[PDB]
Amino acid sequence: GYDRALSIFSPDGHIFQVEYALEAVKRGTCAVGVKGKNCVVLGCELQDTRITPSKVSKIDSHVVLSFSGLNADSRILIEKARVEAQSHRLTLEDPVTVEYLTRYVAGVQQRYTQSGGVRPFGVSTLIAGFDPRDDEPKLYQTEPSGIYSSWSAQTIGRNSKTVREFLEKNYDRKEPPATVEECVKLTVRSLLENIEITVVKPDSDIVALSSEEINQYVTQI
Amino acid sequence: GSRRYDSRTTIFSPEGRLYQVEYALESISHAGTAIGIMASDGIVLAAERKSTLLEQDTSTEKLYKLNDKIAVAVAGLTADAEILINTARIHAQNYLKTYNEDIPVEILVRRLSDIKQGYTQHGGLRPFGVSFIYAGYDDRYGYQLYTSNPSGNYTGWKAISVGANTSAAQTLLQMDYKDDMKVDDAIELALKTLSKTTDSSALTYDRLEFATIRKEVYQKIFKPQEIKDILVKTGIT
Amino acid sequence: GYDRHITIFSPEGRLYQVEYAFKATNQTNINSLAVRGKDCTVVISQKKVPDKLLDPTTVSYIFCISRTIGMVVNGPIPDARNAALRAKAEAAEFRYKYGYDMPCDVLAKRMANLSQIYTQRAYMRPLGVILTFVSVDEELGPSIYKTDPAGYYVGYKATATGPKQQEITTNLENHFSWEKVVEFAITHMIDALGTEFSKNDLEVGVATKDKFFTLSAENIEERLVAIAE
Amino acid sequence: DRGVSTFSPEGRLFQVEYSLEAIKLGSTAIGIATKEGVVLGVEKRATSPLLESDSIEKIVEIDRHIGCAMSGLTADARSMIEHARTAAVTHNLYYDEDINVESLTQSVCDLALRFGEMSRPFGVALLIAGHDADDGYQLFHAEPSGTFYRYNAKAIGSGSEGAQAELLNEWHSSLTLKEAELLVLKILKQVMEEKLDENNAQLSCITKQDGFKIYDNEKTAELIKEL
Amino acid sequence: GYDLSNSVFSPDGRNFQVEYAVKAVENGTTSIGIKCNDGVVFAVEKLITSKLLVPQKNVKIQVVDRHIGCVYSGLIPDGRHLVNRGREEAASFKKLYKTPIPIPAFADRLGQYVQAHTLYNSVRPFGVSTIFGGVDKNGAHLYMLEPSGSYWGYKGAATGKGRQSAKAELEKLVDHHPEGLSAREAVKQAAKIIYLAHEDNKEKDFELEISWCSLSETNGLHKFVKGDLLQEAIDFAQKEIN
Amino acid sequence: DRYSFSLTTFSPSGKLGQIDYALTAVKQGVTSLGIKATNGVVIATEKKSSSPLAMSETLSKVSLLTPDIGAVYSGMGPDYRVLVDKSRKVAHTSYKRIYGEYPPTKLLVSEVAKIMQEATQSGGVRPFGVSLLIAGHDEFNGFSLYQVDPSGSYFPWKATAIGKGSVAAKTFLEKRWNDELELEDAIHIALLTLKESVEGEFNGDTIELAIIGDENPDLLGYTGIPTDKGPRFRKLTSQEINDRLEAL
Amino acid sequence: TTIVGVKFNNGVVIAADTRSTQGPIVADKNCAKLHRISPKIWCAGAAVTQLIGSNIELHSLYTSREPRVVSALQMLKQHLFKYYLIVAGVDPTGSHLFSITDVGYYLSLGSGSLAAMAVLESHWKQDLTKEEAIKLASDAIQAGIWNDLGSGSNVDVCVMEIGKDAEYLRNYLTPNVREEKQKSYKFPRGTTAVLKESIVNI
Amino acid sequence: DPSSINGGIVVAMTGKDCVAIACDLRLGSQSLGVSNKFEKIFHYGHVFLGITGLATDVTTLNEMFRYKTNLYKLKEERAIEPETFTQLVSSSLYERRFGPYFVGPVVAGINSKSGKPFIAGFGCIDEAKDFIVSGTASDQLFGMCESLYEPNLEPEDLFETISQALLNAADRDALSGWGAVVYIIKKDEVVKRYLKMRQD
Amino acid sequence: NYDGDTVTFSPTGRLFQVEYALEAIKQGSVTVGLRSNTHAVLVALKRNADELSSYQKKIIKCDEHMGLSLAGLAPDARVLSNYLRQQCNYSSLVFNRKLAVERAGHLLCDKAQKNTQSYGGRPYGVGLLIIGYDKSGAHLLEFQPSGNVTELYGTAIGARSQGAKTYLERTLDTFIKIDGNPDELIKAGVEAISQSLRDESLTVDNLSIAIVGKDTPFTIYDGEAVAKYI
């Protein structure tokens, strides 16, 4: 078995492979997530649109996962997340909470940063959804190092710093977007600095907005 | 120990890239051009071979059947491709054994791309130097045209080219492709793109591999005479 | 830069570590020659024992692989003993699996295939020895098969190994009971190397129809006396 | 390159010395042990205003009377905490008794040097605080080098160099718990780059009666006013 | 640049790591072996690095089974590693068969093990040369095994720092006594040779350790030379200096 | 074995260096050629002897893989020897145990090339330094001639040459090959092509030639089974080669 | 089943009956029980043959030597011991006859073994010729055919001579050909009632 | 004995340039009849396979042989022949020597090259030239086939012969019946016929 | 070029990774061992990271009859002491026999040597002084990372251990004949370790003493228990 330590500390205390895995994420496309009072809206800015997968993926009926970075690496994380969500139902009789799913995904990413013979995932994920029988929105983020945290609004990918700067002044944690329209319009405005929108609502009510709806938001802005 | 001789294939560059994957994509860029065109009534796979004494009528080096409804065009190392093609054939037959249904095209493409990605993240081995074009039919989406590369990324296309002169071929495809062409029109577009992207002075039947999938779905990998027939009527002759 | 340290190809298509294992075959500075009679195969090997503290009966580069097969090795004795132990296990295993004694050529191919693996797998280095197998095969008669660090083996009418293997080889080329065959090989080694041998300077192995055996210092002196007469 | 388990000519493992400098970049964690309990305080260090700081768990519960702070690569901490929690739970299963704090610190530190071709040592340092009948209120500093010491007062992280000197001046054996709360907040306010408040700092305490408790933003705010 | 790995041939065909392992052996203390007419005598110089060493307690010579004695120079932990393998190997022979392992058979088993440590770069060559031998059904045998895995039978053997002077004295012993030395008298010369070899390491004091395995004196079993015979050899060695 | 990583990797130009260096070894090897006729295939090579005292009869550069399939090589002989052993084994375990018959030529060639590709991607192994010309007959495809490269790529040929004089020989084969060639004509062309590549003596002892042709019931070793045909692979003896060289 | 093996002055002959039974029911009336391991090594039993023969062929290609009956015997013996045959043949060391292990100048196995051994014990003599050996081996099989219910139909004979090719005499004797039936039972067309008829697209 | 759990019979016959394969349709659970549409005859290209025995094994083997003959066609670029398929069946069955499927397979087909009709029974191959029977009524089928069969029957006559043999053997078997299907296989066409029989 | 792995010899025959592991002990706090015929004494100078911190445990108890003290990497000492406890435990289980001190040292000898000849591991960065009492009497053993285990009357390992070791050699003829007066043997150990101090003096928190003997089970003195010996 190949077990070379690929992720090791540099003399300055840095793990270069994890640092370079983050660079792979920053070259990913987009994942803007705006959490509101009742909404979590996820968005991204000769190809066959029917069969090209949407970036937002349902891990379970109530939890969806968007990502940024290496698409091929993300499929492996999403597959492991879906298997775990089913196993938790199978053995603990309950669907996963958003934090439990986030903890498992970040655990796999952390495991790949200190296992021999493997490189870290070049994937950062935005995990959004609702805990079972619950209604307060959750919006978590994971990174290649394994760090996971909860956000009111977050972006990952190219132009993340510009969009996060835009979010940090248009989003106010004093008064989150009260209406689903405000959740989408803020998300579209951030993505306007092509638009896909997915709205995550309690009781497994996850819907992707149509292009006609998105056009109305864009035209309004 | 062997640590001094390890090339560290599965590591990131400081720019976030994977050297071996990028070097494997550079390898395919010198391989023969393979083109896939998804028409309204089917898909067209066309590949340019890359000698007088070569047994051309027997050589099948770029187009392979994976199924009764799925075929692949190959760009890159043919020996590496034969390994992946065998697994795809077994995986498609495993799906039919489990569910009594023909495997969906995307499920097969995803499984093959997951094998490619695995060689990119762990194991210490080099990536497969192969790019595929999957032309397939299933009852869910109908005619589907996918492509996959050594990194394990796969994307669906209406028209796509892999191998040498991909940029030139895609420019021609963008100009001349319509969503409502028929297979015969799609066939014609395939040879013109190959003719205007080949490095040789002329395009002849011995340098070509051709395959179509048409509706029940029927896979036809063209014989040299049939390529010769379609070559003349297209006008390239 | 590391193509010279493990058995991978150089830009010229060469395996330098295999070529350097050939250089290791001549460190002992011992010359050996094998000749076939019509009934017997004879190996003559130089026996150089410079240290007077050595027990000469232990210094030996000729091994009895089986009842009928003998092996003479050119190269360091730890690698020589490694190959000898492997050849003995192969010979015994063949007899167990197939019910009859392994032929000399099958064993030579058997050991050449092992050397081929060291040539292709990076974690195994080549053994720096050349193995000459001799026997009287029940089908092919007297036989000489020589293996090298490259995994290459071939049968020989006669053969010589060592630093002066060329001088012995052309000497055999010009020319081209087992006691006479022994007396021929000793004489031709004296002429080729230009050095008279005492009974302590030579190792002699004789492959006959029923057994392979090595002559003692008394037996070698008997042959030296016969050459004197 | 060089092997991960290599010694330097001075007798120190290269990866351990490199891992220790990763801790110096972490958020500050401060712990003070008194006769009435142990107070643990951490610098939250939220990277963005949109980041929900209440989700930053830099003080965790290991057992009912054992808690710890973390500083450095806090992703490595969760694996160490999960092992610590399992060890505390496994002790109660095998011995029908709560694990000792020093024994819990030993179980964690057994993982520290179990790396080589684990690819690397952990890049996180813990301040383990706990109470038991055998030794009372105890505070330990677990390092990736495998060494740990019992501390009356200890500060780890980016501001540890200045905080520890201040802890030297201020600690005495007669400190009450509320003094320790103020002392931890005082030193945190001194070393944090941000202006200290209930949203960018966290407090926790371990007592025999109430066990391991993390102070709410409300209760911390009242304690912050007292300064 | 061919000396950084164990299993690498230099362009001349040499293994430099094995040659470097020999340099470790030449740095060790002098150990000798003398094959007498019916047994083998082993002697070793034990350097007294400090006065705090417990006398006659840091034993260097090791027994394998009951009839094989082993002494080595260089990296003592490597020699103990080799003897541990030899004891496992002598036992496995005594289980499959019933006789105690023959000395030539034992020599090959150790030689294969030492040679196997030169085959891969993941392992280090042994940093010892072992003088070993004993009495079996075919008489007395004496072997010296080098880090390359090479071993030969010897009438007399020596390794360590004072190996050159010890070899000169052992050669005189072989020259002066073609009839074959006696076991008791060989013990005295073993003391004499070790004391003579110590002049190359006179900067520190040394303790003499002798063991023997004789068909007549020790009934074919390996025993340490202690008590009156040990002191008698020391007096003979001390007298023979002057 | 600590070598679990690939020793063959991509270069920044996309080349696989160990494969290119393995191909260099083949080009430095002795010239071997194959010609496919209407009623047979002929594979021929030079037997280069290391010593005049070596018994070149013992070294067979042409090997029977199955009764109807034979192989010749250029490059590292020991690599070919172990490939032939693996090819013969795979022809039984992978095909003949399952279907009760020997594989068709293209299926054996793909199995041989699979072994070669594995040495290209597996950890701790260099590629094989041989190209093989594999000649065979099967009931449905007739006679075929395949070249297998160290990378694992294989191609069907009407006629081809590999080795030291492959470039010159392939030019000569282009002039002489035609789709109406008979096996005896192919053998004659093969000997002429090998004549221009052999440096020293050109005779039955320095030349190894084999054919895939008619079934040989005389080489079957038993009678009484009408459906057992007899091997099509036949190595020509030194006397036979000399006869065709005397009347050349 | 009746299998015999008889050695004669220049080889060995094996013979067998061709009846296969599933209980009291004759499944195959012309089963071939003489199995070829190698061109001159043949086996008969009262899968292991197709695997031993495969490895014998591979071993013969590896060693470039003719297969030996001891090698087949050793392989069969080791394989069967890991988890009842007559192995005969001619190799460069001569003709051999084994059972699985005992050698013999004549052997018999199967349900008709005792009947066959009776004929062998009665008529076998040293230095048989090839024609006499075939006659003796055939009469032994015929005895099993007439007297043993488990044996019947035809006699298959394989003759392995030292300097010659092995000759497999499939259905050497056919002493049980059915007589012509009293009546022909060809039904007139349309006799069978058909509910549905359809062409199958293969 | 798991073969008698489900019942059912398969018979194959050779004619003049044609083969016939026939089976009953009863799927039973001991005495209880479950399904009358359990066809035990399958084809892979132009090679037909009848499987008697345990029904779950019949489904498992058909899926396995559809698996293997598909990979054969992809690898070989040609359809498998009845003689090659017989070897494939034989090796597949002995691949589970100590875990055997409780089946009796019957191969029927015409070799596409030689044009000669081929039938086979079984791991040990019974390549008969006249007829192969399998199932619970094999003894009844042997009696009927041995009496009715004559060589070189035309396809029309072969249909009547194999039908009457099947119907009358099924009438005397408790676990066979509930309908019957006959395949008259020629090189150019394959005819499938359902027989009228007693439904008890 | 030759110090990057324990599997490499230097051109002069040296093992640099082993020597670098030896340097780890010289960076550690001094611990002194000495013995008479009846008693063996461990004297250790415990080291504290900070004056707000406690002093690291230097002496480990194996069982009633044997214990050790460490200098260097503490996690390595625990690994070795755990292995030593397993060996002593095995002897009691399978033979009802107390493991001899000399035999226990050779088991540490073999375990330490395996990390100096095989790739992947590292030499233990700790030195140990093992005291024990068995049928042969009092025993003091010095363990080194190179695998060398030595039986001594007295010894010192750690930083500035030469001052203690020089004193023990000068006092050698005295303390070996102390015999059945354990407090005077402990006193001689405390004077030796006081010869290795540079700036700090022996305090109640600094000093740690262990003893084992004929009718003395292995006991460790810490805190006020050592105030009579300071």
Curated annotation (Swiss-Prot), chain A:
Keywords: Cytoplasm, Nucleus, Phosphoprotein, Proteasome. Pfam families: Proteasome, Proteasome_A_N. The 26S proteasome consists of a 20S proteasome core and two 19S regulatory subunits. The 20S proteasome core is composed of 28 subunits that are arranged in four stacked rings, resulting in a barrel-shaped structure. The two end rings are each formed by seven alpha subunits, and the two central rings are each formed by seven beta subunits. The catalytic chamber with the active sites is on the inside of the barrel. Interacts with CIC1. One of its GO terms (cellular component) is nucleus. Gene3D superfamilies: Glutamine Phosphoribosylpyrophosphate, subunit 1, domain 1. PANTHER family: PROTEASOME SUBUNIT ALPHA/BETA. SUPFAM superfamilies: N-terminal nucleophile aminohydrolases (Ntn hydrolases). Its main location: cytoplasm. The keyword Signal does not apply. InterPro entries: Ntn_hydrolases_N, Proteasome_alpha, Proteasome_alpha-type, Proteasome_asu_N, Proteasome_bsu_CS, Proteasome_sua/b. This is Proteasome subunit alpha type-4. The modification Phosphothreonine is found at residue 52.
Curated annotation (Swiss-Prot), chain B:
One of its GO terms (cellular component) is proteasome storage granule. One of its GO terms (biological process) is proteasome core complex assembly. Disulfide bonds: none annotated. There is a cross-link at residues 97, 196, 223 (Glycyl lysine isopeptide (Lys-Gly) (interchain with G-Cter in ubiquitin)). InterPro entries: Ntn_hydrolases_N, Proteasome_alpha, Proteasome_alpha-type, Proteasome_asu_N, Proteasome_bsu_CS, Proteasome_sua/b. Pfam families: Proteasome, Proteasome_A_N. Its main location: cytoplasm. It comes from the Eukaryota. Keywords: Cytoplasm, Isopeptide bond, Nucleus, Proteasome, Ubl conjugation. Gene3D superfamilies: Glutamine Phosphoribosylpyrophosphate, subunit 1, domain 1. The keyword Nucleus applies. It is found in: Cytoplasm; Nucleus. Present with 17100 molecules/cell in log phase SD medium. The proteasome degrades poly-ubiquitinated proteins in the cytoplasm and in the nucleus. It is essential for the regulated turnover of proteins and for the removal of misfolded proteins. The proteasome is a multicatalytic proteinase complex that is characterized by its ability to cleave peptides with Arg, Phe, Tyr, Leu, and Glu adjacent to the leaving group at neutral or slightly basic pH. It has an ATP-dependent proteolytic activity. Belongs to the peptidase T1A family. This is Proteasome subunit alpha type-3. It comes from Saccharomyces cerevisiae (strain ATCC 204508 / S288c) (Baker's yeast). The lineage of its organism: Eukaryota, Fungi, Dikarya, Ascomycota, Saccharomycotina.
UniProtKB/Swiss-Prot annotation, chain E:
One of its GO terms (biological process) is proteasomal ubiquitin-independent protein catabolic process. Coiled coil: none annotated. It comes from the Eukaryota. The keyword Disulfide bond does not apply. The alpha and beta forms are probably products of the same gene with different post-translational modifications. Keywords: Acetylation, Cytoplasm, Nucleus, Proteasome. It is found in: Cytoplasm; Nucleus. One of its GO terms (cellular component) is proteasome core complex, alpha-subunit complex. GO terms for molecular function: mRNA binding. The keyword Cell inner membrane does not apply. The proteasome degrades poly-ubiquitinated proteins in the cytoplasm and in the nucleus. It is essential for the regulated turnover of proteins and for the removal of misfolded proteins. The proteasome is a multicatalytic proteinase complex that is characterized by its ability to cleave peptides with Arg, Phe, Tyr, Leu, and Glu adjacent to the leaving group at neutral or slightly basic pH. It has an ATP-dependent proteolytic activity. Present with 12000 molecules/cell in log phase SD medium. Belongs to the peptidase T1A family. This is Probable proteasome subunit alpha type-7. It comes from Saccharomyces cerevisiae (strain ATCC 204508 / S288c). The gene is PRE10.
UniProtKB/Swiss-Prot annotation, chain F:
CDD domains: proteasome_alpha_type_2. It comes from the Eukaryota. Present with 7060 molecules/cell in log phase SD medium. There is a cross-link at residue 106 (Glycyl lysine isopeptide (Lys-Gly) (interchain with G-Cter in ubiquitin)). The gene is PRE8. Belongs to the peptidase T1A family. The keyword Chaperone does not apply. The 26S proteasome consists of a 20S proteasome core and two 19S regulatory subunits. The 20S proteasome core is composed of 28 subunits that are arranged in four stacked rings, resulting in a barrel-shaped structure. The two end rings are each formed by seven alpha subunits, and the two central rings are each formed by seven beta subunits. The catalytic chamber with the active sites is on the inside of the barrel. It is found in: Cytoplasm; Nucleus. PROSITE patterns: PROTEASOME_ALPHA_1, PROTEASOME_ALPHA_2. Keywords: Cytoplasm, Isopeptide bond, Nucleus, Proteasome, Ubl conjugation. This is Proteasome subunit alpha type-2. It holds the Pfam family Proteasome_A_N. GO terms for biological process: proteasomal ubiquitin-independent protein catabolic process; proteasome-mediated ubiquitin-dependent protein catabolic process. One of its GO terms (cellular component) is proteasome storage granule.
